[PDB]
């Protein structure tokens, strides 16, 4: 169950 | 009763929109400056196509790209968002004295009512792997408020794919999985689990960024054209590719990227996550195999990328690829929904 | 039933599809500390375990049972409600121990057992002991329980303390201030910087710091899991009074929580305590909207109050004031949402 | 957020 | 009938000797300055145990051991050498003028007949990890030639075993057995044999060196008394061992190395094959296990070594080990004429 | 009792079988790609020769080339394989589904019965020089399960002969020898081993690979048409040459290759071991004169190479070549069941 | 020595 | 299969 949006910097 | 809620689990849009509704998100995707100026420059290079022209912000978040068209000269802007960002949307719109041009409407796009018909679409509805979210189906459901002849920001979607060697990658997550083949964990064997392991870790897509080295073919693309697609189109995604190997080697995978263009009146802006471009927010996309193929430079890596749609609002992705000349084959199964966020 | 009267549907599905993953067991499972002192609890115990009847509320891949069957169990009955179960029941087959542990699908709630229990098995704890509310599945797992058999783990002991972490709490301001700027791309975002500072402080930071940042000897609230109702833990109140060790700014609350196997041989702990090595639970903290500055040797009193959810969690009120100074700040949080903040 | 935070 | 063709496969005893028929394996051991600077060493240290005295040397090979005591002053020297290699043995004798001390008797010392009762037996019969080549049968054989008072060169034979950490050896040889994990080789799939080829792989004995800080363990030591141990006491060879771990980590394996002392009149020298020692052309010898054990600083790593000698001049070794605190096991074979040359 | 068991001696057979039992020994050939390409190539490509057509594997190994002759569409293939390497065949014919075509027959061909004769025989009986390991003899005598007019793949061999010079290989030898000419080896005089020692390295074939430069005439070349020959040609193979140099300079010896084709009705498929080619893992060998010759550009380099067969598999190798227009002349005799692996 | 040399 | 491993 993860994030649509990939963390980033 | 709507499109959306048909095609949509209730449980995965409520974590869904939950997720859109952090201003912790928003930061992060307007930290991302490669995919917010991009947007700024296409509107903004292109203000011919929204001077005194009524527009349609699709998912708008915070409203970044309402005002990047108001900034544009459009005269009226309906930004619709599901989330409860919306409500930070409309006191932006107050505090920045443009309640007369930008209207937050809130909800879904595929169930929200507009006052008018607009004459372009914006919206920022690319996932990773451009297909995750099913945003794009969202995207092409608007252009029912939209003229004939009304453009779209993106107008197309180019997907790259291309086969990639990555050992250390393959080790990492064969090693991980390997820990389902100890027969003694405390005493107890888990080796039956073993190929359940495997399935599982490696149908994680790999998200991340590499050094274009690891490609071993020129890339294959995939085009949407916004302009011309149906909601339907993207239910059943099939991408046949034929590569044509540079280099020999194994290939561990292929690689994933994908391009957009704003096709506007003054000029073509492109927003481009690729490898051999500065990092954004997406990253890019490596599906693993099970099993490395060898390939030899000169040989043909043909094959197909089957998306099917879940309810879930991702895919099921399936790649089959073979090596011509040997028939050496190798096929996958990917749960996109379930990604391994490396980087 | 008990459990779908609690619990939101959309919370359920994503809870259990998180347990469904064998990545997630294996995380718990190279837990040596939490794997180990399980196993070495039930093991050197042995006669609480020998030919007696086993209950395994949450088996997971059922590691526990296991356990319980090396210990010489004559029937283990291991529930689990995720999908996981059906990997429960693999490795109950290639371990040989088909005749010992049925694997029950379902909640414990909702199941049937055929016969009563001499001992209940479980690894209800989430983070801060409370997340996930499976505590109250332990609980109620006591229907099946003969009257005096016993429970692994038999108490539970949270444990809250003042902490002082200027860094920590500096940088909620400089992740908020992001919005604080009147142009970002033309836009001013400085109407939403008031609600990018609540929402981190809503959010309970998970993550491990040095024991020197703690400023007076926890308070200790148990539940025993023998004598306890799962009435209990829908409210949760925690009086504090503390005993300042240290002068400085008290920033917010730490919580961790031990857990005590009272077997008829001896007692073993499974601590996660910052003074221990850390645990897949690492600890959690929740910060004060405002700093308290403590002299030492003053009192630090208060109450922590976790009301129970139908998001399977807990919100969290916190008052607290300087008694020598009436200087008084609270928190509210939302411990379904944490920040895990470590590195 | 997941229930039990990734660990190594 | 004799002794050694009871116990030995006669194709086994072809290849043997025909190895020790060429020059060029006399020259790579000859080269170990270790292995002859030693030799001569004990020998020349302890002459009065040579001085007019009568000497079996036990495969000589060239004879170096038979000159060594010749310089001693050894009145009479047999040196019995069954392969191809007494002949030449014997133009070296006449070369250097010692046809009247140094009588090169060709054939089987279990076969061949000794004029006299010697007063000591020279030999160099280990092999890597000191059994293989079953010539310590020979040597021990070649007692009922000695004196009641006699001496044996060497006295004694130390193997040592320890635990050992190395990711990198054990990923190495588990990367050549997925070989055979590929479902389409040209076309073909060799899932099926995988179980086999990683027992394979496995069964090999790794011989090369190794920095002493993968040791994660003090060794134990087994000790064979040359001049007390009887041919029968070399059949079946228990080595139990209880490890206290020094080190956490992953136990990928057990490191042999062997000495042996030549306790003479005068003194006693050593020679050490010991990875804290100059390297010699035995290096040592590591058994991978097929999944390694996880023992943490503290834990006892408890089990057997079980040697039994086969007719192809061999041991099949059996290593069963434990970490008693967690019954973490694992059982491994190994074929200790079929060992992988790493260096 | 049988032909095999004749012609070899039992120690010889058994270290023999014994090697090839191992997965690691048929993973070092399969992953050869230039050999189990060549091979999948010269089947499939030729898929007439074996559509619905009944095939015998002489030394399957683990069965991949019967796999490749079910990929062309072989409707009965009698896999024989002599050493334990048979049951590991056996199982992958079972999880490939093919246990109603391929039927693995364990033992030795010259023993084992076959129910049928078969329309071709497939088989890698080349070892190093060709020759080595004597393979090429149990090929043949599998034709009599061969029906009057069936194929053989491979179906001819050629082996090629050159004269090289490799001043620094003839070098190495003496330097390695030199180990025993000194007169104190603690204490211990060895030169009177030092002869032996050379005569040691010199009857050791070279097995490794070269720079086809040090080639100093054209190859010579002698075939073995595996459809015509007979067992007993191959007991003494008798190789005249008479090389015409293309390059002035110290001859050291003759190195050594070999190519076989796959004839079939569509096309010939080549496999080449040459210097020219992508290396294998047969590589290459040369056989060192015992002292160099001298010859000059179109001096004419003439003798004869004779290989006997043994029964430890394998040759004895004597040469014997002179410089016609000098009479100088040099010989050696090789042992080609223990070579020198040289390439690093 | 080995019939087949160790290639790779 | 060898008895003594390559020194050097
Ligand atoms: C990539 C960011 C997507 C963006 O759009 C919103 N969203 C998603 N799906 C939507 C539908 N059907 N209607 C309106 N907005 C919608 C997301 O919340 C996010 O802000
Ligand atoms: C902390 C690990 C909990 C463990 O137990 C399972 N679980 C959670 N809630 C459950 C109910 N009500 N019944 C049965 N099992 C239950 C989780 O899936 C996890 O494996
Ligand atoms: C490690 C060197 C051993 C050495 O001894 C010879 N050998 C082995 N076995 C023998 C028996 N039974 N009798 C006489 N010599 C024997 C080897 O040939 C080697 O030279
Ligand atoms: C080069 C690979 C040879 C291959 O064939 C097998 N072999 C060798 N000699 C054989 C006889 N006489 N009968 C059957 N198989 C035979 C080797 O074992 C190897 O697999």
């Not at chain 2, 509805?125 to 993106?154: I, Q, T, V, W």
């Not at chain 2, 990253?283 to 099917?308: M, W």
Request: glycine share 6%.
């Amino acid at each position: 169950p993860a994030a649509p949006r990939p963390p980033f910097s | 009763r709507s499109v959306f809620s048909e095609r949509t689990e209730e449980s995965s849009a409520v974590q869904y929109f939950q997720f859109y509704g952090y201003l912790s998100q928003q930061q992060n995707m307007m930290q991302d400056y490669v995919r917010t100026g991009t947007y700024q420059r296409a509107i903004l290079q292109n203000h011919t196509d929204f001077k005194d022209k009524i527009v349609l912000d699709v998912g708008c978040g915070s409203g970044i790209l309402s005002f990047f068209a108001a900034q544009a000269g459009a005269r009226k802007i309906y930004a619709v968002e599901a989330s409860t960002m919306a409500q930070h949307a409309e006191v932006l719109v107050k505090s920045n004295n443009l309640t007369d041009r930008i209207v937050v409407i809130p909800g879904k796009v595929e169930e929200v009512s507009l006052p008018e018909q607009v004459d372009i679409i914006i919206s920022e509805p690319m996932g990773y792997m451009l297909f995750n979210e099913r945003m794009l189906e969202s995207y092409l459901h608007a252009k029912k408020y939209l003229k004939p002849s009304g453009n779209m920001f993106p107008t197309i979607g180019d997907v790259h794919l291309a086969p990639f060697t990555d050992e250390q990658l393959y080790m990492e997550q064969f090693t991980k999985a390997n820990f389902w083949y100890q027969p003694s964990f405390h005493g107890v064997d888990l080796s039956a689990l073993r190929g359940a392991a495997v399935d599982e870790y490696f149908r994680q897509p790999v998200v991340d960024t590499f050094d274009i080295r690891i490609l071993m073919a020129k890339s294959v693309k995939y085009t949407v054209n916004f302009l011309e697609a149906k909601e339907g189109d993207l239910h059943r995604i099939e991408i046949p590719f034929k590569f044509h190997m540079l280099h020999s080697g194994l290939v561990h995978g292929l690689a994933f990227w994908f391009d957009v263009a704003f096709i506007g009146s003054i000029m073509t802006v492109w927003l481009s996550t690729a490898p051999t471009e500065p990092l954004t927010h997406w990253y890019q996309v490596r599906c693993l195999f099970q099993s490395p193929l060898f390939a030899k430079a000169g040989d043909t890596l043909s094959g197909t990328c089957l998306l099917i749609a879940n309810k879930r609002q991702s895919y099921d992705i399936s790649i089959v690829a073979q090596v011509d000349q040997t028939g050496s084959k190798s096929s996958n199964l990917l749960d996109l929904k379930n990604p391994f966020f490396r980087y």
